[PDB]
Amino acid sequence: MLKQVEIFTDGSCLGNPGPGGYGAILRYRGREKTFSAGYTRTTNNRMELMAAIVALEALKEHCEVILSTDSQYVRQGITQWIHNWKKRGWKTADKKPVKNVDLWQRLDAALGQHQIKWEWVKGHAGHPENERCDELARAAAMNPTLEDTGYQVEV
Amino acid sequence: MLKQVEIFTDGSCLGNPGPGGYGAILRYRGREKTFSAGYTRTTNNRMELMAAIVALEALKEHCEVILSTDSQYVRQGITQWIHNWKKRGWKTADKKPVKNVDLWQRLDAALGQHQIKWEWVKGHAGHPENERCDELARAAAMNPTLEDTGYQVEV
Ligand SMILES: [Zn+2]
Ligand SMILES: [Zn+2]
């Protein structure tokens, strides 16, 4: 069996678009690693993707990963959109580029390395690791230091 | 003096995108009138715009409108970007069409018809008519009968 790892992710955004941040925890046999960063103009959806991206990309070997997130956007993409995107050349049915394609592909690239068990939590209440990642994400959205270069401004 | 009228608006969407509806209430000196409709695949933000559009377009003369909504998206658009969009011709700084431009332009056309005084409510508790609009909108989302022809599918 592969090294099993727990990943917790969340994102936060003050607007749409607006200052935003992501939070992520990577735990292996008790030891924890935290990821967070804040951006001056982004979306909640993109922060939810970045949190999963940066945690998965930290993995230095093939792993069995339990990925816990309350993002409805990540759930709807993984369970409902990604298959059609793969067989469509990463375009919509109308043959147009998909939104946040830069991050969906980067996330899909990290997914191929590992065996992923997604656990879709209801909210962040109750689970301490999921509350800790919203704290990092919300704190980062309140203190942004970077530019989301991949966000194509729609307003 | 202008006829004063109260208008309450809300939207609901079961996905992003997914089935959705809008709910609006028009009130003229105690008397009350409702508007609502459900769409098969739309977004919550587009339903928030539709709610104010349908209620404002129902007025038959110049009015004083107390327009109450809890929509962050509508509030962001009005209080931040509505002036820049007109000055730029409904384009972004990058010379690209703004998101949901079809509904923002239609709302701007209706808003220019009356003297609008917005009341940004913060929640559903303690706001009966706003709560009704959420109920009207959710009922419509549960019984979609129309297609959001202006929604450009992003997935
Ligand atoms: Zn959360
Ligand atoms: Zn509401």
Curated annotation (Swiss-Prot), chains A, B:
GO terms for cellular component: cytoplasm. Pfam families: RNase_H. Changing residue 134 to A: Loss of activity. SUPFAM superfamilies: Ribonuclease H-like. Residues 1-142 form the RNase H type-1 domain. Binds 1 Mg(2+) ion per subunit in the absence of substrate. Requires millimolar levels of Mg(2+) for maximal activity. Has low activity at micromolar concentrations of Mn(2+) and is inhibited at higher Mn(2+) levels. Can bind a second metal ion at a regulatory site, or after substrate binding. GO terms for molecular function: endonuclease activity; magnesium ion binding; nucleic acid binding; RNA-DNA hybrid ribonuclease activity. Mg(2+) 1 binds at residues 10, 48, 70. Disruption phenotype: In a strain that encodes a retron, the msDNA is abnormally sized. Coiled coil: none annotated. It comes from the Bacteria. Monomer. Belongs to the RNase H family. Endonuclease that specifically degrades the RNA of RNA-DNA hybrids. RNase H participates in DNA replication; it helps to specify the origin of genomic replication by suppressing initiation at origins other than the oriC locus; along with the 5'-3' exonuclease of pol1, it removes RNA primers from the Okazaki fragments of lagging strand synthesis; and it defines the origin of replication for ColE1-type plasmids by specific cleavage of an RNA preprimer. Involved in production of retron derived msDNA (a branched RNA linked by a 2',5'-phosphodiester bond to a single-stranded DNA). This is Ribonuclease HI.
